Design brief:
The chain has three helices and two strands, in the order ββααα. By secondary structure, the chain is α+β, with helices and mostly antiparallel strands. The chain binds one DNA strand of 5 nucleotides through residues 11-12. This is Similar to D. nodosus vapE.
DNA sequence: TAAAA
């Protein structure tokens, strides 16, 4: 997920070439516990989506014009500061992100019994 | 075409 380049050989190529990462990943799920890592999940930012609270339906209200406008807005914001530092969350946003990632992360059970036994 | 798949 956190790889900036992909150094690999083409399907039938002769030598290994270098491709900068030109894609963004978005994942979809209905499980409430998808983060297997127990020592922090800073890569993945879970957004909980609620039906019947969607003001606009993504089936009939997202049209190429609307997504083009969204990407033009993103282009403006990125061109305000064209560096990777501008892509990080705000301090309070990152603070909430820690709690959200922990809440959606798998919990180890052995820790509880170890604590009880040591107590 | 063989490879590489």
């Amino acid at each position: 997920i956190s790889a900036i380049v992909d150094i690999y050989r083409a399907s039938y190529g002769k030598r290994t070439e270098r491709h900068p990462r030109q894609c963004v990943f978005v994942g979809t799920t209905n499980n409430y516990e998808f983060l297997k890592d127990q020592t922090g999940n800073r890569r993945f930012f879970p957004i909980t989506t609620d039906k019947n609270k969607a003001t606009k339906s993504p089936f009939d209200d997202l049209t190429p014009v609307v997504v083009q406008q969204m990407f033009a807005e993103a282009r403006v914001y990125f061109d305000e500061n064209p560096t990777d530092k501008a892509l990080l969350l705000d301090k309070e946003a990152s603070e909430m992100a820690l709690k959200v990632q922990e809440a959606h992360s798998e919990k180890d059970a052995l820790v509880g019994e170890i604590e009880e036994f040591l107590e």
